[model samples]
Structures are given as structure tokens and as C-alpha cells.
Target: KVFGRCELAAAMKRHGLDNYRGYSLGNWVCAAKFESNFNTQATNRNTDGSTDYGILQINSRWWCNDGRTPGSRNLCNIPCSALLSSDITASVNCAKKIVSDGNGMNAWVAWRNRCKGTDVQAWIRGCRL
Candidate 1:
């Protein structure tokens, strides 16, 4: 499922990601845009043989167990395949873990370059959430 901007916003809000761990809903909205353009089936392979999965692009090496990444920590304890679904509960929960565990939003390169410390009021400007 591909999410419209407001659709994604409402979904994440329902998951309680607004102002989650110092990041605003706009920041999450912006990162999700950069991550996968709100497409659930998006996947990207890393040179390390690890892969990024789903809308949040959760990594195989550290977050999920794809049974392929050699040093996968699988911190989310979920199959990488799970993140590929439109059901982002696992992705959101796993991303929250990534943020709370010392990495913050810096774990995602896109977030660092795009959303971090930047004003994203425009990201959710018209979306009431």
C-alpha cells in the first residue's frame, strides 16, 4: 500500500509517534517520505548484503532477521519480511526501539540529512493530526 501524505500522517499519529522521542510528526513524515515515498513494498539492498525493508526502510543488519545478513542483531526480533507490509506497527515499534537505543533519528541517513533539526511544519501543514 502506498500512503498519501495525510494518510501516512494519520497512521503514524494513531501509533502515537507524534513528538516521539523528541522528533515531531513532521520529522517522521519527512523521513518516511525520504525513506520509501510511503510505499510499503520498497526495498533496498546494502553492499554489506543486508537490506532495507518497508516504508521506514528498517535495516536487516540491525533491526530485523532476514536470515541473510551475517551479523544481523535482529533487535526488533521480527522477520525482515514483516516490515514489508503496509501494517507499519512492527516498523514503527522497531523504529522507536532504534531511536531510544542511543541512535536517535541519526540511525537513518535520510533523516540526518533531511529532517534532523530542520523545521518540518510544512510537512504536516495541511494535515490535521
Candidate 2:
């Protein structure tokens, strides 16, 4: 499922992403936009057989067990397929786990490249929080 900006903002807010790990909703939404453009079923395959999944782009090499990613650790303790679901609670939960870990929001390179050291408020501007 694909979401519009404000629609995703509301969903992210409902899942408790607002100000999570000191990152504003804008930051999270910005990351999501760059990662998958708010589409839940998006997937990006890495050269190493690992894959990035869902709106948050959780990686199979570490955060998920895709079975295709041999010897990879499922740090999020979930099947990679789960990340593709439109119900973003699992994606948000795993995202929190990543942020809860040492990586913070830097787990996703899109976040670093697009959202870091930038004014992300534009991503969520005028959205009723």
C-alpha cells in the first residue's frame, strides 16, 4: 500500500513514531519517503542477497530473517516478508528496535543522506498532528 504524506504522518503518529529517539515526525516521514516513498511493499535487493523491505526499509542482512540472506541475524526477530505488510506496526516496531539500538536513525542510509542535518519539517508541514 502506498500512502500520501499526511496519511503516512497520521499512521506513523498512531504507531508512536512522533519524536521517537529524539527524531521528529518529519524526520521519520522524510526517511520513509526516501526509503520507499511510503509504499509498504517496496523491496530493494542488495548485492549480497540481503534485501531492504517496506516503508522503513528494514534490512534482511541484520534486522530480518529472509532465509535468502544466509548467515544473517534477524535482530528484529521477524520474517522479512512481515515488513512488506501494509500494517506498519511491525515495521515501526522494528524501526524502534533499530533506533533503540546504537544505530539510532542512521540505520537507513536514506535517512543519513536525505534527512540528516536537514530541515525535515517540510515533509510533515500543515499536517494536523
Candidate 3:
């Protein structure tokens, strides 16, 4: 599923991500924009044979299992495919767990490379949240 910026903001807010883990809403929005462009079905294979899944691009190496990847920790205990759904509940929950695990949004390379220290205010600029 694909979402516009405002729609994505609304959903994130509904999921209590407005200010999660000392990160701003713009931070999450910015990361998601660069990671998957808000496409829930987004998937990308890494050089190491693991796959990134969903809007946040959660990795199969440690988060979810893609079934084909060997030795996936599956810390989220969810199938990677489940992260590709429009509902976003599972994805958000997993993301929360990931952040709580200590790296925060740094777990997403996109967040570190693109969103971090950037002028992310634009990400939530026009959103009424």
C-alpha cells in the first residue's frame, strides 16, 4: 500500500509515533519517506542476502524472517511479508520493539544517512498533526 505524506503522518500519529523514543514525528516521516516512500509493499535485497521489508525497511537478518534467509533471528517474531500490509499495525509494533532494542532509528540506514541531522521539519510541515 502507498500513502501520501499527510496520510502517512496521520497513521503514524494514530500509532503513537509522534514523539517516540525522543525522535520527532518529522524524523520518522523523513525516514519512511526515504526508506520506502510510504509503500508498505516495498522490499529490497541486501548484498548480504538479507531483505529489507515494509515502510521502515526492517531487515530480515535480525528482525523478521523471509523464509529463504538462513539464520534470521526473527526478533520481531513476524514474517517479513506481514510487514508489507496496509494495516501497518504489525510494522509499527515491530518498529517500536526495534527502537527499544537500543539503536533507535539508527537501525535504518536510510534514517542515519538521509534523515538524521537533516532539516526534517518539512516532512511534517503541512500535516495537521
Candidate 4:
């Protein structure tokens, strides 16, 4: 099962918001919808044995310290920790840095593309606010 609508909503509330009305959150949903239909529990088997987890497509081994447990599966209770420090400021800042570095949203855009194995341009177009 995916993280469900509620989890996606929370993720947007906290991390979403770009220059557009919602910013990253809006674009994120667009990407997620394209990738996994907003399913938080959306998981795909990687040849490397890494598992993509949750609404943000966080990797259990990379993001969750507790391994592939409920923490990685539960968005409501999962501590964003490094991803978000005190607010979505960290993510927002990170995005800005990437953009400032001439990468634009290309890094994030690339992540969405690589993780979901989809067309990057089309995803960006769909996420246009």
C-alpha cells in the first residue's frame, strides 16, 4: 500500500512549496502521481537491493535509521530528521542551492526521473504550477 492521501498531504504541508503557490510540494505530488500515484508505501525492487519507501520516496537504508520498519513506512510519525530541520527550510534551502549552482531543479528533477524511471521533461511539465 502507498502512504495514502493523508500522508502525501502532510508531506506537502511540511516540505512542499516552491516559487509556485505550493512550490516543491505541488511539484512533488505531480512527480509522485506520475511515479507511484501518491502511494507512500510504493516499493520497487532495485538490482542493488535498496528499497524506495514512503511518500517522499525515501530509502529505508538511507533515510530511516530504524531500518525498514514502521518509521520508514509511517509518514505521520516518521521523523524527518536530516531531511527537515525544524521546518521545511532545509529542503527549500537545498533546492535553492541546487538551483543557484546552475543545476536548477534539475537535481531533484533528475532524482524523480531516476527513481521512477520516467521521462524527466514530461514530469516537469506535469508539475508545472
Please, what is the TM-score per model? 0.95, 0.96, 0.95, 0.42
> Tens digit of lDDT per residue, candidate 1, span 91-123?
999988988988788888999998887888778
Poorest 10 consecutive residues of model 3 by lDDT? 120-129
- Please write out the lDDT profile of model 3 over residues 47-105, one tens digit for every residue: 88999999999999998988888777999999999999998888889999998988898
- The list of candidate 3 runs beyond 4 A from truth reads none
> How many clashes (backbone N, Cα, C below 3 Å) per candidate?
0, 0, 0, 13
Query: Cα deviation in Å at residue 54, candidate 2?
Result: 0.4
Residue range 73-105, candidate 4, lDDT tens digits: 422334434332323343343333434545443
lDDT of 2: 0.91
The lDDT per prediction is 0.89, 0.91, 0.90, 0.43
Can you rank all candidates by TM-score, best first?
2, 1, 3, 4
Give candidate 3's total backbone clashes.
0
Q: By TM-score, how accurate is candidate 1?
A: 0.95
Model 4 C-alpha lDDT versus the unseen true structure: 0.43
For residue 116, give model 1's deviation from the true position in Å: 2.0
lDDT of 2 by residue, 1-129 (tens): 998999999999999999988989999999999999899999999898899999999999889888888889999899999999989988999999999988788878999998999999999998887
Off by over 4 Å in 2: none
